[PDB]
Symmetry: D2
Subunit: 197 residues, 4 copies
């Protein structure tokens, strides 16, 4: 059982989403002693944004012909994609920042959605990832951003992740949210339950 | 004469359609308002710093005037970015749709300019109650998308977390007069994209002539 | 009353000795010159963009006035950084020694402000002949090092590629009046570092009182 | 024979140092068909600068006690160091930018000089890398920056690299420089000779 854990909060010890995610990971490890966890930090480390060079390389009509410089432009992307390919369960921890996700997490997504690698087209688009599942652990300052919540329509954090993840083939996605920064305890207890299965 | 702040979020240069269309609007605006001020803030071709833990600590410091000089340094870019907004009457954001949202640099720009006590505030009616601090401003969002149907009524409307999300974040700080001009079909190109770009230009020219 | 530009290159905040010592100088300068302008440019706690290929293409464009708007965007930060320098009479750089040189952010700041036709130029006496374009400026470099002997006469002088290198880069654009104030022994601390910091402060106070 | 190639120019096809380095690498591969080359791009990709968090983690008095967040702060560094450990020959290509190296290369060095990993102290310092050699391939706009050159004392590019590399244990270092951007041809031919041995 291989887990990729992507932490999106820039905060360390003080991060609630990171802490909850780590509570899940620890419980998961207890119940699956053989598990491996890979951590990809995108909160405390400045992940590069997509550049024009990246666009030219990633959408190259004949990728086998990419120059060495273009391959260099894609090397981080390839590494990030590889972590995803090698994992069965993707865990993403993230704050809501301004009704969406921290910019580093947007940057991660922008690196791993890759034509001919995690999606393709025939234009109609097709996902290429299979057999993967994801758990999103998110913390929010306010309230009512969840399903049936008063502010659901303002939530462009996790519902957006579902869209992007869905596009590349990850369609089994669970969200666990703590709001009001009781809800945390319900999340933590929800996570322990999820981990022991 | 509205003072304009243009925020360009495509990493692409001459080839950016979102940038190009926004520049059509700005030039046309300039023609009708020779003395109007236009400031440009690049967030696409320039890596804009993400929000860090030090930024959070400074921005949310309970006694703001007591921030160390180091903390002030952590907010210096934010202060510059916010200042540009305060100086402007009309905000123009040019942006691609990247993976059903905006490029990460634009997200980072937003994260820098939503500032407690500066562009929004709150009181405790225990239950924090938020209030926007920007007034008298308007925004124009000029966007380009590879595919089709991300606009209202579109087959893929629910997947659109780019401009609808921008409208929400801007509304939070008090910019609720927001217009969206979108070109679609950029990936397929053809003459359907030419028409879409043509319509976008005509729309932008009308807007510029009346702003 | 010299206008001052302070460029802080340590990633550390309250704990930065190089920053602290420079702030001692600035405060003391302020006390003697209440109306003096002081601008701070953070290059340590803020990731400053490296020079890119697009920057090179724009900065070295043979017809500069013909740069596209995208190219101008590529130089916008550089223009801001250069402008700060032009506005100043005295430049104060605070910097650690990091691996026998300066932190990468400070190197990036330098790479942004050495600009053809702006802070230096050249003619072809074929064999390019360079000329600095900054005049009437002075620099003060305040530095802190973990070890000892990196100064003149020091056992490790030849390993020092921090301030001696800064002096060379600044000289290239026309700042040849450069003073270096160094504290050493920061890693060992003890009372040898206390003395070194004390001497640095006394030196900086004298400089501030006469600048 | 394992090679780590660190390219420092932000320029792609147009980069002279990159091109010369690749001429060497190709020739080296011809003569040592079993060779492996790892490429670490630090010119066209924004390598993060050392931060206060990095300092706190890297100089932690009791590293085995580092929190997960601190380990995250060091994960890139650990990866960069690992590439170095796994290599026999380090090749660095770099422009001279303002009498030194591009800032990305300074940032790389700042990630790989690591207490207890590539150097230690007993204070007296001690290198920890062994059996490695390096080749620096550098391109300069001007002239006379080499040994015995009129401008030698202004050169804080490769002579500085020697210092930093020397500090962690890489003391067999060769510099091949092209100046005046004939010298290139002499470098290229110098590189082919070096590669066939
Ligand atoms: C820059 C920033 C933006 C935020 N935006 C929102 C928001 O849009 N909606 C919300 O409910 N809370 C918002 N918050 C509050 C955080 O979501 C809340 O503190 C969350 O628990 C932080 O996650 P973390 O503990 O993992 O760092 C924001 C906080 C910060 C620092
Ligand atoms: C990294 C990347 C992600 C993209 N994601 C989407 C997308 O999610 N939906 C879509 O319709 N088009 C998408 N596109 C296509 C672009 O939106 C389209 O090419 C757009 O014109 C780019 O804006 P620009 O021309 O101003 O640079 C994407 C393009 C890139 C390079
Ligand atoms: C990444 C790093 C590299 C360093 N390299 C050197 C060095 O090469 N020589 C030296 O004497 N001290 C070195 N030091 C020690 C620092 O120069 C010293 O702690 C200095 O005070 C840092 O400056 P600051 O206090 O303003 O942050 C290094 C420290 C760090 C964190
Ligand atoms: C930002 C910048 C700084 C430079 N600084 C120097 C310098 O200090 N001394 C020098 O001789 N040439 C300098 N040059 C010229 C370059 O070193 C020369 O173009 C070199 O061949 C570029 O390397 P590359 O072809 O691998 O990109 C500089 C060039 C640039 C773009
Ligand atoms: N009910 C709400 O609108 N809650 N919003 C919380 C937010 C949004 C932005 C921030 N912020 O601190 O930046 O807090
Ligand atoms: N989803 C669509 O129908 N059209 N958009 C095309 C996309 C989506 C993602 C990307 N991408 O390049 O990452 O292109
Ligand atoms: N070289 C010395 O004698 N003292 N300096 C200490 C150093 C050198 C490099 C580092 N470092 O932390 O990377 O510390
Ligand atoms: N003989 C010289 O001083 N040569 N210097 C060349 C340089 C230094 C900086 C630049 N530059 O283009 O930035 O070129």
């Amino acid at each position: 059982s291989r887990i990729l854990a992507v932490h999106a909060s820039p905060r360390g010890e003080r991060s609630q989403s990171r802490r909850l995610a780590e509570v899940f990971l620890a419980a998961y490890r207890e119940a699956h002693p053989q598990a491996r966890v890979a951590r990809r930090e995108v909160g405390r480390v400045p992940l590069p944004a997509v550049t024009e060079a990246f666009v030219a390389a990633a959408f190259h009509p004949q990728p086998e012909q990419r120059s060495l410089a273009m391959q260099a432009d894609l090397a981080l992307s390839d590494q990030l994609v590889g972590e995803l390919f090698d994992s069965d369960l993707l865990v993403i921890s993230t704050p809501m920042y301004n009704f969406s996700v921290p910019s580093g997490l947007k940057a991660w997504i922008d690196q791993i959605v890759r034509l001919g690698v995690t999606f393709d087209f025939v234009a109609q688009y097709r996902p290429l990832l299979r057999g993967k599942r994801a758990l999103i652990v998110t913390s929010r300052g306010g309230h009512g951003f969840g399903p049936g919540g008063e502010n659901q329509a303002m939530n462009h954090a996790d519902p957006w992740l579902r869209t992007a993840l869905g596009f590349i083939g990850i369609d089994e996605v669970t969200v666990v949210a703590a709001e009001g920064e009781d809800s945390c305890d319900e999340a933590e207890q929800r996570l322990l339950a999820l981990a022991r299965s």
